[PDB]
Design a protein around this nucleic acid. Structure first.
Ligand SMILES: [Mg+2]
Ligand SMILES: [Mg+2]
Ligand SMILES: [Mg+2]
Ligand SMILES: [Mg+2]
Ligand SMILES: [Mg+2]
Ligand SMILES: [Mg+2]
Ligand SMILES: [Mg+2]
Ligand SMILES: [Mg+2]
Ligand SMILES: [Mg+2]
Ligand SMILES: [Mg+2]
Ligand SMILES: [Mg+2]
Ligand SMILES: [Mg+2]
Ligand SMILES: [Mg+2]
Ligand SMILES: [Mg+2]
Ligand SMILES: [Mg+2]
Ligand SMILES: [Mg+2]
Ligand SMILES: [Mg+2]
Ligand SMILES: [Mg+2]
Ligand SMILES: [Mg+2]
Ligand SMILES: [Mg+2]
Ligand SMILES: [Mg+2]
Ligand SMILES: [Mg+2]
Ligand SMILES: [Mg+2]
Ligand SMILES: [Mg+2]
Ligand SMILES: [Mg+2]
Ligand SMILES: [Mg+2]
Ligand SMILES: [Mg+2]
Ligand SMILES: [Mg+2]
Ligand SMILES: [Mg+2]
Ligand SMILES: [Mg+2]
Ligand SMILES: [Mg+2]
Ligand SMILES: [Mg+2]
Ligand SMILES: [Zn+2]
Lengths: 64, 87, 95, 117, 272
RNA sequence: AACAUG
RNA sequence: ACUGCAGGGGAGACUGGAAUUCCUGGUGUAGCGGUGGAAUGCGCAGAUAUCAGGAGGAACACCGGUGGCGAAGGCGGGUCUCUGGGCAGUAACUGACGCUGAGGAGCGAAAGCGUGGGGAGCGAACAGGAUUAGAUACCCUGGUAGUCCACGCCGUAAACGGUGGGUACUAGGUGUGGGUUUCCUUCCUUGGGAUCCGUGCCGUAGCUAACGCAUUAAGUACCCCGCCUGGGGAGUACGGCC
């Protein structure tokens, strides 16, 4: 049900600004855990990647 | 701290027979290293109270191992004080 | 010698002929201390997601260094002082 | 004595009042007639009928400067917020795209204390 | 680094002193010393133009390098950190690699043995002197010159610094230590960092005679003089001065800066 | 809005 | 000890974007603000609105939950540096080295105190406006200390799960956090089972004055400590200690 737990050894990366376009919303906000099906540990690893991508200007902090 | 090889040189000087890890000589000598390594942690960072509390736990554990070796063989107690330090 | 990954955003009014020779002066201070450099991938121009320091474009450089911690913190101090560098991001790559 | 064919219509709408300003796409104000400009005083300014009179008064005063089409940027938690958009349409404008530009702090500054009313 | 005395005498009850822990070599460098003498407040006419001056310990002048124009690229080594009676900061003796001795104001964090660069290719380290064109914005600097080539004038007391706000075309915007926003030329030079000895404002001098050692001679209030002496003099008991407060020469309080002084074009904002 | 007391 | 694993546990340094306010400039004209309703107030000397630039401070939207970590107080922007504890497996080593702990010591929200910084917003005190018989209040407009930081002092909270620590046992059902291991292991399904450590809901025996608790006990038991002895007077006086 979780993509990262099923498909093993897939790198959740702050560089990879194309994996992180899914798992964010149209305003730019981090999606909820119960709508992406992630576990606790990969939702942690997604949100840190989004916070690090926003600070290297690969993702906007907010964008209507 | 205390990487997996950094504890090996302490065990070669204070372990009894080439595989000893649990004797009062080995456990005090590893605690004396961590107490030393963490009091120089606490000369920078004078307000790290959470780390300093973990030092009082090692002091309490080292003092109980010192008391056990002095109840069972006082001559092992005298040499271990000389090789590491008391007061 | 810990494996680090330094991401550098460069000013877009530079030229791509002098991106790699310019930062070679920065990377030579890593090599004096026993440091190791592996991958100096240059992404080139890319549209920034927001306007950093009145610029909309910028050159992304990934350093991929492996050195002592005292020398990597020495490096990005010299990178932020350089006026061509807009941002610097240092991350460890192991666990 | 100007001519600007396409502009922007900013609508601020609070619990007390509504201000309807019309600008160019660079943010230079053409006309601004708000809800207390039309004769209203006190809590009558926050009614939706006071909002739609302000949206007419700013629209037909902007058409004297040749404005034919506006973009709408609304903000604020007011109920005179959709009676204003449906009053720029029924005054001779084409309202285009509608955006919410309400400011949202990222746990920023401290709000005032809650009212023991 | 403020040693407090113990209350052994009534004159040392609240008193304190520097710890002097920063100082190496208690004696000065003999070739860089010029003599001084006191004045007691007197000008060339022999009359007191500045009151409350005189007495004081004997002093010698240490030649400070406030120019630092002629060693762009010759590095120096901090040899000693010495006491200077003529100022509130400490001074650092520099041993340049060519063979010349100099004194500069010691910045915060320029301990003995550190290397000090100069010129347009120096590093942004505490003690290096650069033109303002080569210093990035937001940097705390000290010993800044007003005109190019003129010598350091601004922010050079102990603990004081200027924040470099921005540079537009030919002018840098500075925040001076009073909150004054001044605009100066970008070819002006400045030393990177902040002036050391920043704890000396907290020294409680304990007794009257300890300030007599420093050259400060007593100060009589105007309200206990006679009306021929001061405009606040007079009265039969003690008063407030029977008028709005003035100087001993009858001038009122208020702004004494020239309202059309030539440097008004360079001041962005007055202090707060 | 509003309103105490026995 | 070794091998892994999860984590807002802590301290230091650097650093990011949103918003509030102020400053400068443009556009612009007469209102804005506030409430149950108003007024004080701000503005017409160019406010509010709006766009661009700049300075500064404080808190970190989304993730975020019923979830995690910490002895408790507490802990969530990012990165780096230093550092503390826990869990599981292996059973390699030591050989009862344990538990509790009067006194003592250390840590200990917020307010407050000292010295020195900093001060956007908020906001005791204070001031005006309203309401009212009055209004030393609630509501509105302003607004100082304080809230922030560095270093010390203070040692109190409905500091609470109103439940001191250790240990052993005594039906299950059902979510969730961290591991380990088994049959068709890919039956893709990351499903069921077993087991170890948490954290919730229900529920049996038993306990309880009742409400309720119920394998995370307030059940059945053993070890040690703190405390209670009608309500007021009173956690006060007097003496001492800080
Ligand atoms: Mg992870
Ligand atoms: Mg003469
Ligand atoms: Mg005087
Ligand atoms: Mg007299
Ligand atoms: Mg006179
Ligand atoms: Mg008199
Ligand atoms: Mg009298
Ligand atoms: Mg942490
Ligand atoms: Mg902003
Ligand atoms: Mg301000
Ligand atoms: Mg404005
Ligand atoms: Mg953080
Ligand atoms: Mg045996
Ligand atoms: Mg105990
Ligand atoms: Mg006790
Ligand atoms: Mg304390
Ligand atoms: Mg406090
Ligand atoms: Mg204080
Ligand atoms: Mg103060
Ligand atoms: Mg009042
Ligand atoms: Mg108030
Ligand atoms: Mg007070
Ligand atoms: Mg601190
Ligand atoms: Mg609490
Ligand atoms: Mg109690
Ligand atoms: Mg018990
Ligand atoms: Mg359980
Ligand atoms: Mg229950
Ligand atoms: Mg009971
Ligand atoms: Mg009694
Ligand atoms: Mg008492
Ligand atoms: Mg007493
Ligand atoms: Zn997962």
């Amino acid at each position: 049900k979780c993509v990262f737990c099923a498909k093993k050894d897939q790198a959740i990366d702050y560089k990879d600004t194309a994996l992180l376009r899914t798992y964010i919303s149209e305003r730019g906000k981090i999606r909820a855990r119960r709508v992406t099906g992630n576990c606790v540990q990969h939702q942690r690893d997604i949100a840190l990647a989004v916070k690090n991508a926003r600070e290297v200007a690969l993702l906007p902090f907010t964008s209507s | 701290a205390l990487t997996a090889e950094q504890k090996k040189e302490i065990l070669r000087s204070y372990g009894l027979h080439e595989t000893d890890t649990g004797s009062p000589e080995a456990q005090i000598a590893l605690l004396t290293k961590r107490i030393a390594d963490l009091t120089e942690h606490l000369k920078v960072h004078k307000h790290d109270h959470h780390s300093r509390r973990g030092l009082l736990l090692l002091v309490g554990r080292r003092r109980r191992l010192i008391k056990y070796i002095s109840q069972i063989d006082v001559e092992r107690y005298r040499s271990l004080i000389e090789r590491l330090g008391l007061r | 010698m810990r494996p680090y990954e330094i991401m550098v955003i460069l000013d877009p009014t530079l030229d791509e002929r002098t991106v790699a020779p310019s930062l070679e002066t920065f990377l030579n201070v890593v090599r004096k201390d026993g440091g190791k450099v592996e991958k100096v991938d240059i992404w080139g121009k890319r549209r920034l997601a927001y306007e950093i320091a009145k610029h909309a474009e910028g050159i992304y450089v990934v350093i991929d260094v492996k050195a002592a911690p005292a020398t990597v913190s020495e490096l990005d101090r010299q990178l932020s002082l350089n006026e061509s560098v807009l941002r610097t991001k240092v991350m460890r790559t192991d666990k | 004595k100007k001519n600007v064919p396409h502009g922007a219509a900013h609508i601020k709408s609070t619990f007390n009042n509504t201000i309807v300003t019309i600008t160019d796409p660079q943010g230079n104000v053409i006309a601004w007639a708000s809800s207390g400009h039309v004769g209203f005083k006190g809590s009558r300014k926050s009614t939706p009928f006071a909002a739609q009179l302000a949206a007419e008064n700013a629209a037909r005063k902007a058409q004297d400067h040749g404005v034919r089409k506006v973009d709408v940027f609304v903000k604020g938690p007011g109920s005179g917020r959709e009676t204003a958009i449906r009053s720029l349409q029924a005054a001779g404008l084409e309202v285009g795209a509608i955006s919410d530009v309400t400011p949202q702090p990222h746990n920023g500054v401290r709000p005032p204390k809650r009212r023991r009313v | 680094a403020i040693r407090k005395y113990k209350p052994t005498t009534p004159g040392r009850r609240g008193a304190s002193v520097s710890d002097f822990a920063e100082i190496t070599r208690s004696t000065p460098e003999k070739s860089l010393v010029r003599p001084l003498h006191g004045r007691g407040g007197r000008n060339a006419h022999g009359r007191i133009t500045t009151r409350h001056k005189g007495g004081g310990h004997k002093r010698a002048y240490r030649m400070i390098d406030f120019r630092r124009n002629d060693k762009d690229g010759v590095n120096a080594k901090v040899a000693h950190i010495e006491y200077d009676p003529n100022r509130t900061a400490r001074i650092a003796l520099l041993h340049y690699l060519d063979g010349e001795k100099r004194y500069i104001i010691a910045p915060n964090g320029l301990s003995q043995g550190d290397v000090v660069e100069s010129g347009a290719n120096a590093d942004i380290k505490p003690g290096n002197n650069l033109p303002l064109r080569n210093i990035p914005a937001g940097t705390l600097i000290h010993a800044v010159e007003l005109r190019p080539g003129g010598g350091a004038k601004l922010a050079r007391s102990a603990g004081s610094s200027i924040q470099l706000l921005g540079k537009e075309a030919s002018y840098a915007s500075l925040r001076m230590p009073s909150g004054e926003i001044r605009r100066v030329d970008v070819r002006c030079r400045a030393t990177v960092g902040e002036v050391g000895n920043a704890e000396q404002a907290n020294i409680n001098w304990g007794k009257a005679g300890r300030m007599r050692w420093k050259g400060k001679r007593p100060s009589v209030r105007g309200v206990v003089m006679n009306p021929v002496d001061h405009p606040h003099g007079g009265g039969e008991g003690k008063t407030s001065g029977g008028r709005h407060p003035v100087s001993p020469w009858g001038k009122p309080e208020g702004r004494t800066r020239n309202a059309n002084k030539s440097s008004n074009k360079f001041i962005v904002r007055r202090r707060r």
